[PDB]
Amino acid sequence: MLVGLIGYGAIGKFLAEWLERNGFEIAAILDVRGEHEKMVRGIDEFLQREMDVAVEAASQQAVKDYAEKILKAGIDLIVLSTGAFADRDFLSRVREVCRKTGRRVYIASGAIGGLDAIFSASELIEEIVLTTRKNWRQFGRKGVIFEGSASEAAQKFPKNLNVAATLSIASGKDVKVRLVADEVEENIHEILVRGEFGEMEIRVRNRPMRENPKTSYLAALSVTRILRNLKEGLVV
Amino acid sequence: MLVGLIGYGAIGKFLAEWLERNGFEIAAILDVRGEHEKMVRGIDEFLQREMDVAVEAASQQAVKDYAEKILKAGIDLIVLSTGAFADRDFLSRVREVCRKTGRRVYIASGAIGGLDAIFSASELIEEIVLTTRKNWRQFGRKGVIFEGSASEAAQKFPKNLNVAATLSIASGKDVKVRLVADEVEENIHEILVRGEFGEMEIRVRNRPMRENPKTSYLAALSVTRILRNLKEGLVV
Numbered sequence: 432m433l434v435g436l437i438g439y440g441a442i443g444k445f446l447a448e449w450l451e452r453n454g455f456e457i458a459a460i461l462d463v464r465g466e467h468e469k470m471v472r473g474i475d476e477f478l479q480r481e482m483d484v485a486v487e488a489a490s491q492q493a494v495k496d497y498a499e500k501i502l503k504a505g506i507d508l509i510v511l512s513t514g515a516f517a518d519r520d521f522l523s524r525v526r527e528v529c530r531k532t533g534r535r536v537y538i539a540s541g542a543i544g545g546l547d548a549i550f551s552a553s554e555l556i557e558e559i560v561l562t563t564r565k566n567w568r569q570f571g572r573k574g575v576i577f578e579g580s581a582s583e584a585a586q587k588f589p590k591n592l593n594v595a596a597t598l599s600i601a602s603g604k605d606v607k608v609r610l611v612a613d614e615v616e617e618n619i620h621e622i623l624v625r626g627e628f629g630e631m632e633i634r635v636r637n638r639p640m641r642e643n644p645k646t647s648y649l650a651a652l653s654v655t656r657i658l659r660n661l662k663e664g665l666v667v
Numbered sequence: 668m669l670v671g672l673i674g675y676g677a678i679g680k681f682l683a684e685w686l687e688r689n690g691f692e693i694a695a696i697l698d699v700r701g702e703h704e705k706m707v708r709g710i711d712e713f714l715q716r717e718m719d720v721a722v723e724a725a726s727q728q729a730v731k732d733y734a735e736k737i738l739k740a741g742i743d744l745i746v747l748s749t750g751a752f753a754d755r756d757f758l759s760r761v762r763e764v765c766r767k768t769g770r771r772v773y774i775a776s777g778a779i780g781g782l783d784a785i786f787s788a789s790e791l792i793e794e795i796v797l798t799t800r801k802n803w804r805q806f807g808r809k810g811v812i813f814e815g816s817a818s819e820a821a822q823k824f825p826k827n828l829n830v831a832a833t834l835s836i837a838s839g840k841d842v843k844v845r846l847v848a849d850e851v852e853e854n855i856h857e858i859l860v861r862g863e864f865g866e867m868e869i870r871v872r873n874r875p876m877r878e879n880p881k882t883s884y885l886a887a888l889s890v891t892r893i894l895r896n897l898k899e900g901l902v903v
């Protein structure tokens with residue numbers, strides 16, 4: 432399988448090795464910084480290579496800048512910076528493109544688990560709340576950093592809070608979000624969901640990636656699930 | 668989109684109605700019992716009808732009897748009675764058929780969540796335990812009914828505990844299982860997972876389906892997630 436990588440940071444570096452290690456072939460790697468045998472600097476160079484799928488592990492802006500071009504080029508897209516879709520108009524436009532091109536956009540499960548159950552019961556969800564606890568240093572302050580809706584959070588926290596965006600897309604609800612800055616060495620996400628289906632609680636304590644403590648290692652791993660599902664018979 | 672349903676019980680009856688209220692078309696319904704306009708009694712009658720995917724919501728035996736034929740007919744299969752895959756040989760042959768035909772077998776998340784995160788971090792799982800609490804009546808008594816591996820659980824409880832089989836498939840580990848019979852009126856599943864990625868806890872308090880108290884409403888819904896994903900450009 433031919434895979435193109437957009438973003439060669441903490442997640443991209445990991446994925447590049449994972450691909451080479453798991454029999455995958457790297458078509459190209461797009462990034463403004465960094466070095467690699469398959470590295471390119473512009474989306475045009477990137478799209479000249481034939482590839483079965485492209486993985487976005489760069490930023491929300493990258494999704495907005497490249498998503499449509501990649502899909503129109505006949506390539507499916509795995510997205511990690513799902514926060515880009517917090518913009519309803521963009522999300523709709525992207526869904527429109529998929530419709531006409533027959534292309535697909537895969538939402539990586541990212542730094543949490545349980546998206547499967549949540550999407551399954553979306554029609555019957557009555558209440559869903561996300562509480563995130565991460566190291567205060569980035570916020571330069573400890574305590575409750577934000578408490579409100581995911582849409583509002585997206586406004587005051589661009590290029591971050593992708594989990595909230597993904598949960599909103601999966602549930603079809605404007606997820607309640609509470610962001611906490613604490614003296615924690617792990618990235619913690621806790622989700623509570625209630626509805627006609629019953630109740631479910633999900634708690635994830637993520638080990639941060641060395642190259643970027645802001646990103647949960649599980650988020651990089653979530654991409655490998657999708658890549659494996661594309662290649663194998665049994666899909667989970 | 669055309670969908671073939673195998674099994675017309677609690678889940679199948681729900682799905683037949685769901686399909687028609689959501690823009691899908693019923694290609695056929697296979698069950699040894701029951702009545703419906705598109706009902707058929709044999710797998711051969713079933714496979715003569717054009718369909719984009721087949722849903723198994725019948726029994727483990729149905730998966731073993733029909734799986735290979737369906738994939739061979741050029742039809743992908745969504746599986747709910749995942750316990751059939753406890754049969755390592757059958758699982759192997761199914762994987763073998765998928766390779767050649769290029770067909771897919773979708774493992775429904777069923778009555779639990781987190782398979783996404785579990786499969787994602789499958790290479791880094793050190794411990795995974797499932798704790799299930801069900802109504803005691805079917806057991807004839809209350810208390811801890813079983814403690815051991817998922818494989819031995821499958822032996823002591825044939826045609827049951829598919830959630831344990833699903834977890835084993837996703838994690839690649841023979842999950843530790845503990846079953847308790849209580850006065851509770853719904854199936855409560857708790858999953859503990861620990862590894863280099865960090866830790867994850869999932870708890871799901873389900874609601875039993877009226878047509879079959881032993882089945883969790885969420886399990887029926889878990890199939891709608893896969894159907895929607897198949898039909899949509901955006902895959903959650």
Ligand SMILES: NC(=O)c1ccc[n+]([C@@H]2O[C@H](COP(=O)([O-])OP(=O)(O)OC[C@H]3O[C@@H](n4cnc5c(N)ncnc54)[C@H](O)[C@@H]3O)[C@@H](O)[C@H]2O)c1
Nearest residue numbers: 438440441442462489490493511512541542593643646650
């Ligand atoms: N959905 C989730 O659960 C989840 C979890 C963690 C991280 N993420 C997302 O994935 C990305 C974080 O990844 P990381 O930890 O790899 O970040 P990183 O900062 O370590 O690396 C990002 C790389 O992308 C490059 N980049 C950014 N925009 C680009 C563009 N438009 N074109 C080319 N290259 C570009 C940067 O130069 C950098 O090298 C973040 O945007 C974050 O939004 C999502």
Ligand SMILES: NC(=O)c1ccc[n+]([C@@H]2O[C@H](COP(=O)([O-])OP(=O)(O)OC[C@H]3O[C@@H](n4cnc5c(N)ncnc54)[C@H](O)[C@@H]3O)[C@@H](O)[C@H]2O)c1
Nearest residue numbers: 674676677678698699725726729748777778829879882886
């Ligand atoms: N993966 C999960 O989380 C999960 C959860 C609940 C149920 N399940 C599975 O799904 C099925 C139970 O679903 P339900 O509640 O719909 O059961 P149900 O007993 O209400 O209905 C099952 C239907 O399947 C039919 N059937 C069984 N084997 C058949 C065969 N070989 N050919 C044709 N028809 C056949 C039956 O006659 C019945 O009408 C069970 O096998 C259970 O093993 C899985």
